[PDB]
Design a protein around this ligand. Structure first.
Ligand SMILES: Cc1cc2nc3c(=O)[nH]c(=O)nc-3n(C[C@H](O)[C@H](O)[C@H](O)COP(=O)(O)OP(=O)(O)OC[C@H]3O[C@@H](n4cnc5c(N)ncnc54)[C@H](O)[C@@H]3O)c2cc1C
Ligand SMILES: Nc1ccn([C@@H]2O[C@H](COP(=O)(O)OP(=O)(O)OC[C@H]3Oc4nc5nc(N)nc(O)c5nc4C(S)=C3S)[C@@H](O)[C@H]2O)c(=O)n1
Ligand code: FES
Ligand code: FES
Ligand code: FES
Ligand code: FES
Ligand SMILES: [Mo]
Lengths: 287, 765, 160, 53, 106, 160
């Protein structure tokens, strides 16, 4: 139950933080919400040298409509993602997808930044963000990198962030005027980590034809997965129940799910689903 | 006049303690100079050892001592089970740790080495630094493979359990004299309670030529093993946050603490890790059932039969094998069962040792039967419902002293069903049923299912349960009981019982229990027992104080008389001209030659004791599920469990027990199973893997459905209720699901995963 | 190994103490602050009991190191009752028998508290279930808890 | 008398209000009877514990 | 007297006692101890005659144990108590006192 | 404002702890080095019980600030007993009923200890009285203590 011994320093700003851990260092880790790091410590499944609490850095919890994108600071709680600017048929999909994350008490301290740099294979925000073609700006001491979400998500519990290199902001292509967006998830208990789930968005050409669509998968491999070629099936189409079903059937054929106590390999893949099928369905309703 | 307390919805007494934060739990307790104990547990399911002596543990500053088997094995000896029947085979064998093994290890979770530090953090810190050498051994996991060689746990002659059989009538000529004969093998889960409070123990020694203070009545074992009595107890009252029979009795941790506290004179505190709980404490539910059933062309029972294999885990805790003896007794439930063979194997595997989870052996058996029934109702095609209607009880043929070796539950003697009529319950308990039937209106709702529950509640228990009543000075009454407050509102039930017999508001009764200095003797609260037993004590005592008053308050004034108007809190005399209060009597008689109360249960010839108390409750559970054919998720649309039980002391708190019990059972039916990898490693150790039911999934609906029919022959005729809610939650769901596809009642292995509900389009092909 | 000087306002009362960083807030609140009201069941943000009000938001006292609460307001189940009277939530929790052991009581009550104190919304059985869902109980079946919360919100608003 | 041990008292309440523990040395330790009546919480519930004097 | 321990001033075990002042405690509390220890000898010697089958006459009877006859067999005083377990009973005494008190010093 | 770190040897076990300067050695040796063996009766170097071995010399744990004892060997009444067997001084004290209450027992015993352990002198009734005189008792008075000490010194030296 009890963590190992470690040292702790409250970060006053971005640079001062980036410094504090560097010389820390080596296996010094940053801490935001705690909701993944602290449980890991209670299990003694990670033993760092010192923690740097960035959670008090003032300019990091902002929401902004900046230009053609929407800017989200890394310290933005999920709790806010449910109740925010999120309007204008540019919800765009997040508050529905962030609603599946456990329970209010966790959402109240969890951050978008950490959730990404942790990257559980069942982490919801990555799946939904990849469908939005996300854009993460990870400022470090030397410079300021910008990682597309396809590159950020490496593996289960693994991100493309070199030690240091703190995620500062997340940006999203605003989308689509007008279109439809829906996210659904299957789990034995609500709020739990899903067996399988889908995030699909479609944009329609006046009136019934389609111009662009993007689809992603939860519980596919070790990360969120683009269903790129399933997207081509959709595009230029009538959007009947003869292409949605066909897109879904081909949105799965390439997956390698890992079996769990709740999931058999094929079941898991066969539970990638109809999550696609009904998410694509809910994407379309005058939207 | 006056009013009545019993049978009334009275807001329970325990509430205010828990709501405000005044309530003390074993973990909340702190004592100066404390040593925090962390136990180094097994990481092998099966292995012999060549342990280190850290050293590197003891080296870490703040570590006072490290207990190996060297210390605890000389002694005390192996944990010591209980009374006092069952000593017909000879174990050990088991009990459990016991107390720490340096020979063989028999499950991941078993205590090997205990450390003692200044804070609990330094404890886990140094416990890691302990290194144990292991030699792995062939790992047992399957109950059947257990008894048929080739791998063994107790490498002597032992070797793998106890064999419990029960039979009478002619089973075979009944099987010969029948048209339709039915067979199937059912397999049940591995759950436990998994309460919200993990295990916790605090021990304070009086190092001066004296005793031990313990927080967390089975003092009896620890006392013996330490050879510390005459007790010398001293068990102290702390409120408990969920037993469900899991926290049971004596653990290895319990005795290590006492030993170490004694041989050091230093306060010792232990609080369990959740991961520890899921691997250390009473498992249950794991049974295999082979079942043969004989039928005439009418479809009444002519006899049941076959084998049951209980996976007891690695050792014999409590039950011992009380549970295993009980199970082999009541697989037949409430039925016409002319004869049967019931043969049971209590077997061992490399898993957490088994205890008595809420209604132990009843969830398990009740599944196998109401599933071998639905299957006959498939093979003869006769209606699932009226099978039971045709074939439960003998309305007229009561008392019904059963056929086979019965009752023997656990023993001596009889027994039989004298509790009220079975069916007009099943009949009358069908508010809503037949219109719950109107389906599908071709749809996707699919389910309807039934389950039935007799319970050996009662388990006398027994033979007695101590009680006591004290009225004194300041306008309050204090009631001492042998029972235990575990969450069922025992302190309230008694408060009513006493209040009724004493003519005084229950807001004035305080209840004391589980303070062994105060209460020198008593049984606990097991198999739905205490309200008849410990309540019958409280009555007996409260019935004694009234005679102490209404006969020696007769002398305090004039006259005998002896009189009209017995009580309104006092005694207005021979008319309404005034009186002596009941507290004023007590206020008078303390230094003056005597003392002003009573603890009448009991004397050398016992009391209160309701003696081998039979007292079988019964009922139905009614279930309507909706399925999502791919995904295989489900929404239980309607749920209603039924119960006939004695008098029902409190309708409000009884509803809690019934509803609460069901959700545990539904949890067992579709959510909970202890999973193990091929090498014996436990998988479901955290809370994300072991799925407890949550607010959203559970039915907004649970219909309290209780009926007061014929009361038994135990005063104010009552029954045990805290275990009937769960019983049938297995059988009803399963039958509901198989009706819900359909392709017919062919499900065995519980629970029911959505992956299993991937009969989806193996329904279309 | 160097202790951190923490300053926290608990239930109105301010505190100043050295703690080692690794100590979980839950254990800080129980020791030496000696408010056993907060209870610990799971160990990874699930059980519920764990739950406390941090700066107005209900968070788990068990996924937060104590040091992380520096210069912040914290409230526990102890802070509900004021002057002998039980706060409406506790009162209705008893009225509907919404508890049996005691453990899942700090958790639920503190989760419900800010929701109560803010003027919206109603809580109907369906929306009530979703509210408490972040907390687990093994005794009541929630049925009575769901019934308990609703009652609390009726004497609150539509009050007669 | 002027004994070597000066007077000393320790009281621990069980705030469950049920009771009260007194490792105080009140010299008829069975004269909780006074404290009980005085405090009007009698008579057990004022449970006295043994100490050397 | 080594094997004997004494507990006092712990009002949970001892709901009623007088105390210790005015050079008293021996004939009073020692007088209590006597008819307590004299209540067991009957509770025991009576109970021992039922345990074996010999009536209440024997050798003269102390070890502390029970020699009937001269000189076959014996039952210790502790085994008697250990035997009175949850067998319908209880292996002890506390006879001082009732209404019309005990011990009696007036 | 000012904390002080003690490095003291007590009955063998060395301790490191921060204490406020004004805490007296007696209070320190009872908290949190829970060695209640040392007892406190007067408050100004008279009662006797107070007495402990400091660096081989018996001094009052009560006229010494705990802080003054840094880097020094300290021994209390707990340190006499060596594996169950009571130190002979303790035996003769019981053999001669040299104690009734208990208080004036740490004091005398610790006063007598270094005197015992060193090879001289004999202690005869007259020289015995002068030795213990630095300690007061309200129960014996001394006659049996004086008789007790002498006995201890005979089984010591001439000893059959
Ligand atoms: C019961 C329970 C259920 C849960 N269910 C879900 C679920 O269904 N889906 C889900 O996605 N999550 C779930 N979580 C936890 C999830 O990981 C949190 O949403 C996430 O941890 C939020 O906290 P955080 O991002 O501040 O990371 P925290 O662990 O709270 O804070 C420190 C973490 O941030 C990480 N980090 C690394 N680099 C950076 C950086 N540059 N900036 C910020 N942080 C960084 C570190 O690796 C470290 O793990 C659950 C947690 C619990 C306790
Ligand atoms: N308000 C009540 C409470 C109980 N009863 C019934 O009267 C008897 C008194 O309870 P008890 O003797 O304690 O019954 P058990 O010893 O079997 O314990 C109660 C039962 O139901 C329980 N309810 C629990 N509830 C809570 N909150 N926490 C637990 O740990 C509980 N543990 C249990 C366990 S264990 C069981 S098996 C029980 O037969 C019960 O069915 C009643 O009529 N009215
Ligand atoms: S136990 Fe810490 S959050 Fe549930
Ligand atoms: S009573 Fe045990 S958790 Fe609610
Ligand atoms: S009190 Fe310190 S010497 Fe007497
Ligand atoms: S001081 Fe009281 S007995 Fe010596
Ligand atoms: Mo139970």
């Amino acid at each position: 139950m009890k963590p190992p011994s470690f040292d702790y320093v409250v970060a006053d700003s971005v640079e001062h933080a980036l410094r504090l851990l560097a010389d820390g260092g080596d296996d010094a880790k940053i801490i935001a919400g705690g909701q993944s790091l602290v449980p890991l410590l209670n299990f003694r499944m990670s033993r760092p040298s010192l923690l740097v609490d960035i959670n008090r850095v003032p300019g990091l919890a902002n929401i902004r409509k900046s230009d053609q994108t929407i800017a989200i600071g890394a310290l933005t709680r999920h709790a806010k993602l449910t109740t925010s600017k999120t309007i204008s048929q540019n919800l765009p999909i997040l508050s529905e997808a962030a609603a599946w994350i456990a329970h209010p008490q966790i959402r109240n301290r969890g951050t978008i930044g950490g959730s990404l740099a942790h990257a559980d294979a069942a982490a919801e925000l990555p799946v939904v963000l990849l469908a939005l073609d996300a854009y993460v700006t990870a400022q470090s001491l030397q410079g300021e990198r910008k990682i597309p979400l396809k590159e950020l998500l490496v593996s289960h519990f693994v991100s493309s962030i070199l030690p240091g290199e703190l995620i500062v902001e997340v940006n999203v292509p605003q989308l689509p005027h007008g279109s439809g967006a829906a996210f659904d998830e299957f789990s034995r208990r609500h709020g739990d980590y899903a067996i399988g789930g889908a995030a699909s968005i479609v944009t329609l050409d006046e009136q019934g034809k389609c111009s662009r669509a993007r689809i992603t998968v939860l519980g596919g491999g070790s990360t969120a997965i683009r269903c790129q070629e399933a997207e081509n099936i959709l595009i230029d189409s009538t959007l009947s129940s003869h292409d949605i079903a066909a897109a879904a059937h081909a949105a799965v054929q390439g997956l390698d799910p890992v079996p769990t106590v709740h999931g058999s390999a094929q079941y898991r893949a066969q539970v990638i689903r109809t999550m696609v099928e009904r998410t694509l369905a809910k994407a379309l309703h005058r939207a | 006049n006056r009013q009545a307390w019993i049978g009334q919805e009275v807001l329970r007494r325990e509430d205010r303690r828990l709501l405000t934060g005044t309530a003390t739990f074993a973990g909340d307790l702190g004592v100066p100079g404390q040593l925090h104990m962390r136990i180094v547990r097994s990481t092998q399911a099966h292995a012999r050892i060549v342990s280190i002596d850290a050293t590197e543990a003891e080296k870490t500053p703040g570590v006072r001592m490290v207990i190996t088997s060297e210390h605890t094995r000389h002694l005390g000896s192996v944990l010591l089970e209980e009374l006092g029947y069952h000593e017909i085979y000879e174990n050990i064998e088991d009990f459990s740790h016991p107390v720490l093994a340096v020979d063989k290890v028999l499950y991941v979770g078993q205590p090997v080495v205990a450390v003692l530090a200044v804070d609990p953090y330094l404890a886990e810190d140094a416990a890691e630094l302990v290194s144990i050498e292991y030699e792995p051994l062939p790992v047992l996991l399957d109950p059947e493979e257990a008894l048929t060689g080739k791998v063994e746990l107790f490498p002597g002659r032992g070797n793998e359990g106890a064999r419990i059989k029960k039979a009478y009538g002619d089973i075979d000529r009944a099987f010969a004299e029948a048209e339709h004969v039915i067979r199937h093998k059912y397999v049940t889960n591995r759950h436990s309670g998994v309460p919200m409070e993990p295990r916790a123990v605090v021990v304070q020694p009086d190092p001066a030529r004296d005793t031990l203070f313990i927080w967390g009545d089975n003092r009896r074992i620890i006392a013996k093993m330490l050879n510390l009595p005459e007790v010398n107890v001293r068990m102290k009252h702390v409120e408990i946050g969920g037993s469900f029979g899991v926290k049971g009795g004596v653990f290895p941790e319990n005795v290590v603490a006492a030993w170490a506290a004694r041989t050091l004179g230093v306060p010792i505190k232990w609080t369990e890790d959740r991961v520890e709980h899921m691997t250390s404490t009473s498992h249950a539910r794991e049974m295999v059932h082979k079942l043969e059933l004989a039928l005439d062309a009418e479809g009444r029972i002519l006899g049941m039969k076959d084998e049951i294999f209980h996976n007891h885990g690695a050792y014999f805790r409590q039950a011992e094998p009380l549970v295993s003896d009980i199970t082999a007794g009541i697989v037949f439930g409430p039925y016409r069962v002319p004869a049967y063979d019931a043969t049971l194997h209590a077997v061992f595997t490399n898993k957490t040792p088994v205890g008595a989870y809420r209604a132990p052996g009843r969830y398990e058996s009740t599944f196998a039967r109401e599933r071998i029934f639905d299957l006959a109702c498939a093979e003869i095609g006769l209606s699932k419902t009226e099978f039971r209607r045709r074939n439960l009880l003998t309305a007229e043929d009561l008392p019904w002293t059963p056929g086979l070796d019965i009752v023997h539950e656990p023993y001596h003697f009889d027994s039989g069903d004298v509790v009220k009529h079975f069916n007009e319950a099943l009949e009358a308990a069908n508010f809503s049923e037949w219109l719950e039937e109107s389906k599908r209106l071709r749809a996707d709702g699919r389910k309807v299912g039934v389950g039935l529950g007799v319970l050996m509640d009662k388990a006398g228990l027994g033979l007695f349960e101590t009680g006591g009543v004290e009225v004194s000075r300041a306008g309050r009454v204090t009631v001492k009981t042998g029972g235990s407050s575990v969450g069922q509102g025992i302190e309230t039930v008694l408060a009513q019982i006493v209040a009724e017999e004493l003519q005084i508001a229950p807001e004035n009764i305080d209840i004391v229990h589980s303070d062994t200095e105060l209460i020198p003797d008593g049984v606990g609260s097991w198999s739905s027992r205490s309200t008849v037993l410990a309540g019958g004590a409280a009555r007996k005592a409260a019935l004694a104080v009234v005679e102490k008053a209404r006969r020696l308050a007769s002398e305090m004034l004039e006259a005998d008389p002896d009189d009209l108007e017995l009580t309104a809190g006092s005694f207005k005399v021979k008319g309404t001209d005034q009186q002596i209060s009941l507290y004023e009597i007590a206020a008078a008689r303390d230094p003056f030659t005597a003392r002003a109360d009573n603890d009448e249960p009991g004397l050398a010839a016992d009391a209160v004791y309701m003696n081998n108390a039979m007292n079988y409750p019964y009922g139905v559970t009614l279930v309507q599920i909706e399925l999502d054919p791919d995904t295989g998720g489900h929404r239980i649309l309607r749920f209603s469990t039924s119960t006939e039980a004695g008098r029902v002391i409190n309708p409000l708190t009884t509803r809690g027990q019934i509803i609460g019990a069901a959700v545990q059972g539904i949890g067992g039916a579709l959510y909970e199973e202890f999973l193990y990898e091929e090498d014996g490693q436990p998988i479901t150790t955290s809370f994300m893997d072991y799925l407890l039911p949550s607010a959203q999934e559970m039915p907004n609906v649970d219909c309290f459905v209780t009926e007061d029919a014929k009361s038994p022959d135990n005063p104010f005729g009552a029954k045990g209720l805290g275990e009937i809610g769960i019983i049938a939650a297995g059988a009803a769901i399963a039958s509901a699901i198989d009706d819900a596809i359909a392709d017919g009642v062919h499900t065995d292995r519980l629970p029911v995963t959505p992956e299993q509900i991937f009969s989806r389009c193996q329904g279309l092909n | 190994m160097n202790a951190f000087r923490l300053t926290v306002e608990v239930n109105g009362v301010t505190h100043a103490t050295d703690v080692e960083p690794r100590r979980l807030l839950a254990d800080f609140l129980r020791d030496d602050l000696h408010l056993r009201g907060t209870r610990v069941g799971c160990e990874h943000g699930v059980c519920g009991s764990c739950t406390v009000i941090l700066d107005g938001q209900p968070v788990r006292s068990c996924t937060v190191l104590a040091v992380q609460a520096n210069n912040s307001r914290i409230e526990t189940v102890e802070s509900l009752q004021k002057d002998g009277q039980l706060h409406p939530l506790q009162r209705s929790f008893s009225k509907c028998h919404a508890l049996q052991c005691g453990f899942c009581t700090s958790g639920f009550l503190m989760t419900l508290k800010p929701l109560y104190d803010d003027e919206d919304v109603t809580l109907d059985a369906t929306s009530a279930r979703e509210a408490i869902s972040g907390n687990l109980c093994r005794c009541t079946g929630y049925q009575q808890i769901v019934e308990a919360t609703v009652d609390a919100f009726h004497c609150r608003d539509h009050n007669d | 008398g002027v004994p070597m041990e000066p007077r000393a008292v320790v009281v621990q309440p069980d705030p469950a209000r049920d009771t009260l523990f007194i490792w105080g040395t009140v010299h008829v330790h069975d004269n909780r009877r006074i404290i009980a009546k005085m405090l009007n919480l009698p008579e057990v519930n004022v449970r006295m514990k043994h100490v050397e004097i």
